[PDB]
Amino acid sequence: SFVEMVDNLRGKSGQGYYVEMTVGSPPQTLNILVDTGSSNFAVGAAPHPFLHRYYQRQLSSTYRDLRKGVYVPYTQGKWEGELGTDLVSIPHGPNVTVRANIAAITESDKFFINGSNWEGILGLAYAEIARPDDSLEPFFDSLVKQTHVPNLFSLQLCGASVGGSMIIGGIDHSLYTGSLWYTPIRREWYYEVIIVRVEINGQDLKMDCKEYNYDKSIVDSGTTNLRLPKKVFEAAVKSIKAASSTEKFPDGFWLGEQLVCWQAGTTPWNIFPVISLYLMGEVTNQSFRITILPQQYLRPVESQDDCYKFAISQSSTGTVMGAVIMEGFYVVFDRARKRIGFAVSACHVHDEFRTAAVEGPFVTLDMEDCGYN
Numbered sequence: 150s151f152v153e154m155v156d157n158l159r160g161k162s163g164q165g166y167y168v169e170m171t172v173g174s175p176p177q178t179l180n181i182l183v184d185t186g187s188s189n190f191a192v193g194a195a196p197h198p199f200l201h202r203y204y205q206r207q208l209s210s211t212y213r214d215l216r217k218g219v220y221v222p223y224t225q226g227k228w229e230g231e232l233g234t235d236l237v238s239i240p241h242g243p244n245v246t247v248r249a250n251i252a253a254i255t256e257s258d259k260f261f262i263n264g265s266n267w268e269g270i271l272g273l274a275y276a277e278i279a280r281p282d283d284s285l286e287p288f289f290d291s292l293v294k295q296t297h298v299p300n301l302f303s304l305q306l307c308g309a310s311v312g313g314s315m316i317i318g319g320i321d322h323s324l325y326t327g328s329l330w331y332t333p334i335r336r337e338w339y340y341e342v343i344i345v346r347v348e349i350n351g352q353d354l355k356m357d358c359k360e361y362n363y364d365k366s367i368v369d370s371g372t373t374n375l376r377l378p379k380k381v382f383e384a385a386v387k388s389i390k391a392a393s394s395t396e397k398f399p400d401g402f403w404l405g406e407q408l409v410c411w412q413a414g415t416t417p418w419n420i421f422p423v424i425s426l427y428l429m430g431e432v433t434n435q436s437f438r439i440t441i442l443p444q445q446y447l448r449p450v451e452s453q454d455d456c457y458k459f460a461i462s463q464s465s466t467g468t469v470m471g472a473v474i475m476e477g478f479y480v481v482f483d484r485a486r487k488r489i490g491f492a493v494s495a496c497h498v499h500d501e502f503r504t505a506a507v508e509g510p511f512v513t514l515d516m517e518d519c520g521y522n
C-alpha cells in the first residue's frame with residue numbers, strides 16, 4: 150500500500166535524504182541515501198569514524214561473495230569496496246525481498262558525512278552508469294525483474310529536521326496538488342532532461358538553450374544544490390546580485406563559502422528572485438516551467454540570527470537539478486514511459502506573496518536544438 154510508504158524518508162538539513170533498508174539474513178537495518186545521480190547500491194561494511202553501524206557480511210547466511218573489487222567516484226567524494234549479493238528489503242516500501250548486488254564499502258574519501266545518520270547509498274539511475282560496468286544490475290532493476298513492483302518511483306523531498314516520501318512502484322495523488330507535467334528522459338543513463346529556457350523574475354536569461362544543457366542536464370536527489378554550467382551560473386548570479394543589490398553580501402557568499410545572517414524573522418525574501426526552468430514537454434513544440442522560490446536556493450545553516458548559504462553553484466559537467474529544485478516538487482521517475490513528472494508538492498516551502506509552481510503548456514520552437522551532442 151502507498152500509505153505505508155508516505156513519510157519513509159528522513160534526514161538532517163543539508164545532509165541527505167535516506168530510506169530504511171535491511172540487508173542479509175537475519176536482516177541488518179541500515180539508513181540509505183536516496184541517489185538518482187548514480188546506479189550503485191553500496192553500504193559501509195567496515196568501521197568508519199562517521200559510521201555508527203555497518204554491514205557485517207560474516208553475520209549473513211545469504212551473503213554471496215562476487216570476488217570482484219569496485220570503486221565509485223562522485224563529484225563530492227568516492228569509495229571502494231568488494232562486490233557481493235544479498236537479500237534486501239525496504240521496511241516502509243513494497244512488501245518484498247530481493248537478491249540484489251551490494252558493494253561492501255571498505256574504504257572511502259569524503260563520502261560519509263558526520264552526523265548525517267545514513268550508512269549507505271541507493272543509486273537509482275540506469276545500468277549504463279553502474280560501476281564497474283553496465284553488467285552490474287542496479288537495485289531497482291533487480292526489484293522490477295524479481296517482483297511485480299511497477300517500473301516507476303516518485304520522490305517527495307520536504308525541506309523547510311528533513312523528511313519526505315519515496316513511493317516505490319507508483320504515484321500517490323495525495324502528496325501533490327494540481328497536475329503532473331512530464332519531461333522526456335532523453336537517454337537512459339543519468340536521469341537526463343532538456344532545459345529549453347531560463348527566466349529570473351520573469352526576465353529571459355536569453356542564452357543559447359544549448360548552454361543550459363552543456364554538456365548534460367540531470368535530475369539528482371543526491372546533490373544538494375542547483376548546479377549550473379559556468380556560463381549559465383555567471384549569468385544567474387549576475388541577475389540575482391542585481392535583484393538583491395539593495396543589501397550587503399561578501400562575494401564569497403556567492404561562491405557558497407560564507408553565510409549571510411539577518412535578525413531572526415527579518416530575512417528580506419522579497420529581494421531575491423524566483424527562478425523558472427522550462428523543460429521539454431511531451432508533445433511537439435511544447436514545454437512547461439517549474440518555478441523555485443529563494444527559500445529553496447538560500448538554505449538555512451544552523452544566536453537569534455537566521456543564517457543562509459547560497460545553494461546555486463558552478464559545474465563543469467552540466468546542469469544538476471539537486472534538492473534545491475526537487476524540494477519544491479513531487480517528482481515522478483516514470484521509467485516505464487521514459488519521462489519525469491513534476492507537480493507542486495503538498496510540502497512546498499511558503500512565501501507570503503509568491504508560490505513554487507508547475508505551469509503549462511508553453512510553446513517552444515526548436516527544442517531539440519537545446520540538447521548537447
Ligand SMILES: CO[C@H](C[C@H](O)[C@H](COc1cc(F)cc(F)c1)NC(=O)c1cc(C(=O)N[C@H](C)c2ccccc2)cc(N(C)S(C)(=O)=O)c1)C(=O)N[C@H](C(=O)NCc1ccccc1)C(C)C
Nearest residue numbers: 163164165186187222223224225226227260371373374472
Ligand atoms: C552526476 O553527479 C553524481 C553525483 C551523485 O549524486 C553524488 C551522490 O551522493 C554523494 C553524497 C556524498 F555525501 C558523498 C558522495 F561522494 C556522493 N552526489 C554528490 O557528489 C554531491 C553531493 C552533495 C551533498 O552534499 N549531498 C548530500 C548527501 C545531500 C543531498 C541532498 C540534500 C542534502 C544533502 C553535494 C554536491 N555538490 C557538488 S554541491 C555542493 O551540491 O554542489 C555533490 C555523480 O557524481 N555520479 C557519478 C559520476 O558521475 N562519477 C564520475 C566522476 C565525477 C567526479 C569525479 C570523478 C568521476 C557516477 C556514480 C554516476
